[PDB]
Amino acid sequence: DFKPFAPGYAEDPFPAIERLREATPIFYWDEGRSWVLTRYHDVSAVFRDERFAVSREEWESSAEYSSAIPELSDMKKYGLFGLPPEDHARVRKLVNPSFTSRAIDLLRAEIQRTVDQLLDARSGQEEFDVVRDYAEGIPMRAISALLKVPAECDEKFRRFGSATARALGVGLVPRVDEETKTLVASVTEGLALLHGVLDERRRNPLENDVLTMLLQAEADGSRLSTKELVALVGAIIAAGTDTTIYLIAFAVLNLLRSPEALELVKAEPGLMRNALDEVLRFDNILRIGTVRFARQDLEYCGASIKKGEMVFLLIPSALRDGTVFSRPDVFDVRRDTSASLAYGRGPHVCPGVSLARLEAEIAVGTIFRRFPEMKLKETPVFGYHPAFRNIESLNVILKPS
């Protein structure tokens, strides 16, 4: 039984996937039209198995997929998930330096400012929603600061980011939870806006600037094409928005749920970094996981997988694998989290890992330092986002009494 859209699954998928993981390393998911890998070692292996491709054009349903949401056709083919291996490496080699911990450190001040202003704006009420009043307003500001886009454009870009991430699932994953017209509008509006931002930066290039750097790469030799560049910036916005919102929300939730964990991070603020990694290890935000496609017929974990068939890596399951993490069903902010696959492995490893950790460190660190007695008002509400165990609301009382 695998029903990742069943009511309750997002809130707590662990009993259901544990049953799966213990019974089998692999199964075919009817509605998902793909194989599903449940165990750490098989999941981890596939990340680094060149037999399994990332490009959706290797899928048996590629035609149906490329035709869906034609406004995103360029992003699908020239984006990081679509480029051929040689081109993918080129693009990553080009942008990776811009995302190191050192490079993104400069954003520290602006992120703190945003976090400060969100807390000042709303901390006074009876009720505070860690999603809508806090987490939701942080990640795009971070990305926009990195892109040197005015705070005025934040809301429109966040809408683009969140819409794009869902739209990319249409025809690929089972149940995208929104009206197509609305999705396409936000995507169109966002791409237009992005075009304007890029044209302006071409007009006024800047020093030590990611976009300027990309634009110069595009102008000079053959290091980056216009479509690759647009697909890259679009993907950065779409990949880095909702993911980070849920990290922040899940972090606060999990620290409210473990007084012992919270107490350790209060005692040793230096543990926050490890705690945030353990949030994704213990309670991974992905509903199912990520996908790969078989480039040829092969046998795997006792299954006969055919060329072009999709495979889902069941991340929240692999990350509860007891052969890899001891006491895997315990949230332990002191554990070694090195083996967590939350940010991927191999050439496609998430470039935003440092930016995400920084944003969450500032956001989660600040809220608990400023309101150390914060308490859950009532059970968080979860939704049916096709990719995420999305928290819709996380209502708290900042200073209870």
Ligand X SMILES: C/C(=C\c1csc(C)n1)[C@@H]1C[C@@H]2O[C@]2(C)CCC[C@H](C)[C@H](O)[C@@H](C)C(=O)C(C)(C)[C@@H](O)CC(=O)O1
* C-alpha distance from residue 171 to each of 38, 57, 272, 315 (Å): 23, 13, 39, 21
Q: Any binding-site annotation on 10?
A: no
* Binding of ligand X by 243 (CB under 6 A): yes
Considering only 254, 290, 340, 393, the residue that binds ligand X (CB under 6 A) is 290
Residues of this chain that interact with ligand HEM (CB under 6 A) are 80-81, 92, 143, 235-236, 239-240, 243-244, 247, 280, 290, 342-344, 348, 350-352, 355-356
State in Å, rounded, how far the first CA of the chain is from the last one: 45
* Binding of ligand X by 10 (CB under 6 A): no
8-state DSSP, 380: P
Q: Which does 210 bind (CB under 5 to 8 A by kind): ligand HEM, ligand X, none?
A: none
* Binding of ligand X by 351 (CB under 6 A): no
Minimum CB distance to ligand X, residue 165 (Å) = 3
Cβ 395 vs Cβ 128: under 8 Å = yes
* Sole window of 148-156, 166-174, 197-205, 368-376 interacting with ligand X (rule: CB under 6 A): 166-174
Q: With CA atoms as reference, report the closest residue to 289 among 391, 167, 173.
A: 173
Cβ 359 vs Cβ 111: under 8 Å = yes
Considering only 4, 13, 32, 79, the residue that binds ligand X (CB under 6 A) is 79
Q: Which does 169 bind (CB under 5 to 8 A by kind): ligand HEM, ligand X, none?
A: ligand X
* Residue 12 CB coordination number (10 Å): 11
Q: Which does 92 bind (CB under 5 to 8 A by kind): ligand X, ligand HEM, none?
A: ligand HEM
Minimum CB distance to ligand X, residue 381 (Å) = 20
Residue with Cβ nearer ligand HEM (34 or 244): 244
Residue with Cβ nearer ligand HEM (173 or 280): 280
Q: Which does 275 bind (CB under 5 to 8 A by kind): ligand X, ligand HEM, none?
A: none
The strand pairing partners of 314, in sequence order, are 289
Q: With CA atoms as reference, report the closest residue to 368 among 271, 246, 266.
A: 266
Return d(Cα 265, Cα 396) in angstroms, integer: 19
Q: Which does 174 bind (CB under 5 to 8 A by kind): ligand X, ligand HEM, none?
A: none
**Buried-exposed string 343-366: b where 16+ CB fall within 10 A, e elsewhere:** beeeeeebbbbbbbbbbbbbbbbb
Return d(Cα 53, Cα 387) in angstroms, integer: 19
Considering only 169, 171, 316, 351, the residue that binds ligand X (CB under 6 A) is 169
Q: With CA atoms as reference, report the closest residue to 234 among 151, 143, 142, 169.
A: 143
Q: Residue 245's Cα: distance from chain center in Å?
A: 9
Residue number with the shortest CB distance to ligand HEM? 352
Residue with Cβ nearer ligand HEM (85 or 400): 85
* Binding of ligand X by 311 (CB under 6 A): no
* Binding of ligand X by 314 (CB under 6 A): no
* C-alpha distance from residue 17 to each of 9, 79, 175, 269, 387 (Å): 10, 31, 19, 33, 16
Residue with Cβ nearer ligand X (115 or 170): 170
- Written as six digits, the tokens of 269 are 């603020």
Residue with Cβ nearer ligand HEM (281 or 398): 281
Q: Which does 191 bind (CB under 5 to 8 A by kind): ligand X, ligand HEM, none?
A: none
Q: Which does 355 bind (CB under 5 to 8 A by kind): ligand HEM, ligand X, none?
A: ligand HEM
The strand pairing partners of 375, in sequence order, are 397
- Identify the H or E element spanning 311: strand 310-314
Under the rule (CB under 6 A), what is the footprint of ligand X?
A: 75-76, 79-81, 165, 168-169, 172-173, 235, 238-239, 242-243, 286, 290-291, 386-387
